[PDB]
Design a protein around this ligand. Structure first.
Ligand SMILES: [Zn+2]
Length: 918
């Protein structure tokens, strides 16, 4: 055996990643050495790139969805860094979010206690946010992400609270912040108002009842019938107490049945089929003639006005709608239109209050009962007026914080108005809805489809309720002047308070007297002013991050508008929309130029992960099992715009891809490890195969770069993997192994191969660096030749190199064309496959080929087909229109194993010379 006379060609870079052990060391080093600050300080930075982090709640450990999000951000930011830009990426945390306060409250309830002191409760919430911000920060670093994690933004910083308040001041001074009284979403479970982003729709069972309201004697006399009762359909028996009207569709036909029921003619057939009313119609009336008749509520005997409603539908129900201004927004406006009572005797806890007694709306026995709990008894009380009871399922609004169903209560709250013209920064006049719709058209969405989701919501959304009733957050800190009963928006007052918040934070709103909160010049008038104590919607706070982070730091944490924001596609309903709206108030544009979205992490079945469902995979477990580089590759190598399913099969597949990349890098490093570095300084005579590989490398590099530019990491990785698998491994490394292992170290053709391998490794490192950063750091650590060739101490010194310049290639060189020779290779491999099956030969190297097409380069044919001889021999094995195959007319060389030896067990001519080398 001559095995030990070959070139060793080994590298210290290991085939095994040992990721669990090695990655923590890399990430710990990047922290100690301040790699992100070093990236920002890079002297040759050219151009700038800002990614503005949307703030996760400072509560709980990270889940897989957080890791997906931060990994994608990291790939995007690293790509821009390696392109040569100065990067701005300050991660941040939402410290005032409802989860923080809900968690504290649940703990106190679990501990059989409560905390009623505002300053101390706020302190406990801050302490909780501090704890989980640190935990999450360290968990994010364990993913190998780089950003300003040592100087994150935090909504609970006093400066940040002031920035939020100053954003609210801008809204107020532009005339868009106004008090309104109307029914809105009300969470009884947390005694607070809420808006759309705080609601989760869930299917819920409900009573579904048809109720007769008999017309009064005098109305029957006017209509000229003996009996008539309008039938209403409702899923909310709990609001029947607050009925003031029955609304009909204008200019529509109502049918009166033989038994005396009055319903829309258009719905009679359906209603009679349900058994709600009898089948025989006796009279038809126009709704215009029914308006101003009066009926009797069967629940409490009160009058109910027959009214005409705008757009009463005839698709469901009966065409007659029980109208309760206190509990329905459309109902409210109809009530006001007819100057009717707004009956609302349900308290902040969702219970009937003394109003039902005072106004005789409902029996005293209901006092203190929760509206949903009373419904069964209410339905029983309806007696013969209940024509049909069903149970249905419908999509119903739930308070996301408490998971409980919401109700609606007429209440006075603060709103940002959507359809109120305001003065634009350019002097024109537009509503916030108009500005937001204009703004969206100037934003790039990835996927494109995301634009339509947000646009539709902005087209449809109502005024935004800002005021909340809770124990933690930023106060809506304005004074009401008791002399005018209106808010004080005087600049000197607002700036005074904002300044106090900047220095001391918002605890002063609770602790200071009105006098102390006012400027010196108002203190005489302190007695006239009373604090608003409502808390701001935290969706407003987070929608203000652009102002608090990008604008208020004047560019030091990135530009406003940001270049990119990147979050879950559920943020169209959340942070994207709130940030859009606040940006449109302040700047009349979006505070972002581009939105990239990802889907959710789900189980192998595609279902969402829940503790209850038992299908939760912890991030900790995933990372320990596979390592961060594998998890990162799994993100990048998949369709992250849609849901990503966690299963063993998919992780196994990603592991196989990681292995192929790592094994290829190892082979390259091993095979240029012995090259004298003096080769870097000179041109080489490259072979046709060398040139084909370099030209291929250039073509695929352009393709990967294009795919990565459009955030299509799957497309780019498939290009890279095909190049690695097919042209590089399949063709180039197979052809070059004989030279690499068996040629003299002095051999010029070998040195030229090494230079190609060096260029190839260089491009692999550049394109993989955003994704497998730890692994490429490790590559460079193990390869002095790569560090010198790339002029890089470490991964942060990588740049997109010009292989042409680095290899001294000639500008006019005509590209190779390997179509003919590759077609011959394919045909030969097909033939060889068949012969192997027949047991005729075991290896291509056992063969000689005589090619019919004499145009082809014979050295190249030998390399690509891996035969031992090109030309005619004696023992024919097979023939085709293209070529004849024969047994090679030589012995197997004991050293290189090619059939090129004239004598048995004797080194071939090449090998003899290398063995004798002095
Ligand atoms: Zn040999």
């Amino acid at each position: 055996e001559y095995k030990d006379t070959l070139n060793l060609n080994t590298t210290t870079f290991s085939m095994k990643g040992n990721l669990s052990v090695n990655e923590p060391k890399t990430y710990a080093k990047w922290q100690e050495q301040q790699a992100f600050k070093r990236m920002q300080a890079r002297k040759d930075n050219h151009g700038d790139f800002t990614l503005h982090d949307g703030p996760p709640y400072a509560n709980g450990h990270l889940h897989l969805g957080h890791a997906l999000n931060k990994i994608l951000k990291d790939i995007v930011v690293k790509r821009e860094y390696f392109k040569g830009k100065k990067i701005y990426y300050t991660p941040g945390w939402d410290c005032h979010g409802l989860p923080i306060e809900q968690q504290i409250l649940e703990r106190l309830e679990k501990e059989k206690t409560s905390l009623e002191n505002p300053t101390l409760f706020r302190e406990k919430c801050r302490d909780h946010a501090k704890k989980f911000l640190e935990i999450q920060k360290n968990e994010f670093l364990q993913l190998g992400v780089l950003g300003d994690f040592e100087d994150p933004y935090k909504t609970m910083d006093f400066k940040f609270e002031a920035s939020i308040y100053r954003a609210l001041v801008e809204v107020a001074k532009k005339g868009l912040l106004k008090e309104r009284h109307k029914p809105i979403y009300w969470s009884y479970a947390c005694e607070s108002a809420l808006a759309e982003a705080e609601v989760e729709y869930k299917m819920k069972k409900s009573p579904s009842i048809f109720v007769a309201f008999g017309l009064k004697k005098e109305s029957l006399e006017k209509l000229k019938v003996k009996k008539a009762s309008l039938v209403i359909w409702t899923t909310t028996p709990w609001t029947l107490y607050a009925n003031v009207a029955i609304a009909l569709k204008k200019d529509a036909v109502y049918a009166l049945t033989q038994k005396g029921y009055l319903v829309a003619k258009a719905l009679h057939e359906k209603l009679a089929a349900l058994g709600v009313v009898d089948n025989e119609i006796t009279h038809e009336f126009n709704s215009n003639d029914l308006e101003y008749l009066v009926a009797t509520n069967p629940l409490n005997q009160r009058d109910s006005l027959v009214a005409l409603g705008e757009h009463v539908g005839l698709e469901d129900g009966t065409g007659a709608v029980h109208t309760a201004p206190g509990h329905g927004e459309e109902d409210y406006y109809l009530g006001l239109r007819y100057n009717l009572e707004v009956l609302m005797s349900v308290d902040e806890k969702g219970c009937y209050d003394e109003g039902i007694i005072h106004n005789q709306l409902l029996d005293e026995s209901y006092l203190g009962e929760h509206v949903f709990k009373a419904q069964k008894r209410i339905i029983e009380q309806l007696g013969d007026s209940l024509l049909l009871e069903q149970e249905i399922e419908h999509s119903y609004p739930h308070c996301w914080r408490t998971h409980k169903p919401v109700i609606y209560r007429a209440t006075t709250q603060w709103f940002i108005l959507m359809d109120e013209p305001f003065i634009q920064n350019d002097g024109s006049q537009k509503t916030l809805r108009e500005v937001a719709l204009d703004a969206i058209e100037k934003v790039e969405f990835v996927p494109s489809s995301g634009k339509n989701r947000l646009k539709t919501m902005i087209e449809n959304r109502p005024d935004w309720c800002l005021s909340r009733q809770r124990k933690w957050g930023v106060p809506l800190a304005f004074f009401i002047d008791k002399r005018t009963n209106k808010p004080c928006f005087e600049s000197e007052v607002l700036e005074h308070v904002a300044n106090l918040f900047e220095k001391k934070g918002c605890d002063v709103w609770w602790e200071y007297s009105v006098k102390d909160l006012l400027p010196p010049s108002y203190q005489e008038d302190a007695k006239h002013y009373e604090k608003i104590m409502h808390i701001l919607d935290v969706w407003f706070d987070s929608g203000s991050t652009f102002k608090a982070v990008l604008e208020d730091y004047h560019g030091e944490k990135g530009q406003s508008p940001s270049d990119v924001i990147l979050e879950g596609s559920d943020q169209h309903r959340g942070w994207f929309q709130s940030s859009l709206l606040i940006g449109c108030v302040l700047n009349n544009q979006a505070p972002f130029k581009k939105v990239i979205t990802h889907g959710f992490i789900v189980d192998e079945k595609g279902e969402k992960m829940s503790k209850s469902k038992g299908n939760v995979v912890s991030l900790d477990k995933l990372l320990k099992t596979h390592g961060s580089d594998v998890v990162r590759l799994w993100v990048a190598f998949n369709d992250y715009q849609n849901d990503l399913r966690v299963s063993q099969t998919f992780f196994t597949q990603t592991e196989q891809h990681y292995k192929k990349f790592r094994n290829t890098l190892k082979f390259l490093l091993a095979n240029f490890s012995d090259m004298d570095l003096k080769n870097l300084e000179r041109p080489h005579n490259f072979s046709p195969l060398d040139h084909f590989m370099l030209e291929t490398l250039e073509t695929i590099s352009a393709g990967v770069n294009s795919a990565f530019e459009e955030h299509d990491f799957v497309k780019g990785l498939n290009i890279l993997m095909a190049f690695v698998t097919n042209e590089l491994s399949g063709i180039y490394l197979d052809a070059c192994k004989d030279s690499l292992y068996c040629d003299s170290k002095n051999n010029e053709k070998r040195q030229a191969i090494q230079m190609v391998l060096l260029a190839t490794a260089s491009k692999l490192c550049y394109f993989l660096a955003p994704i497998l950063t730890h692994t490429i750091e490790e590559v460079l650590e193990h390869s002095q030749a790569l560090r010198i060739f790339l002029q890089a101490k470490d991964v942060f010194d990588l740049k997109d190199i010009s292989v042409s310049e680095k290899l001294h290639l000639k500008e006019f060189k005509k590209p190779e064309n390997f179509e003919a020779v590759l077609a011959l290779r394919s045909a030969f491999n097909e033939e060889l496959d068949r012969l192997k099956k027949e047991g005729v030969i075991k290896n291509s190297l056992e063969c000689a080929i005589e090619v019919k097409e004499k145009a082809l380069d014979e050295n190249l044919v030998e390399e690509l087909l891996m035969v031992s001889f090109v030309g005619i021999a004696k023992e024919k094995l097979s023939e085709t229109p293209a070529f004849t195959l024969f047994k090679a007319p030589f012995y197997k060389c004991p050293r290189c194993w090619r059939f090129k030896s004239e004598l048995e067990n004797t080194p071939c001519k090449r090998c003899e010379q290398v063995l004798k080398e002095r």
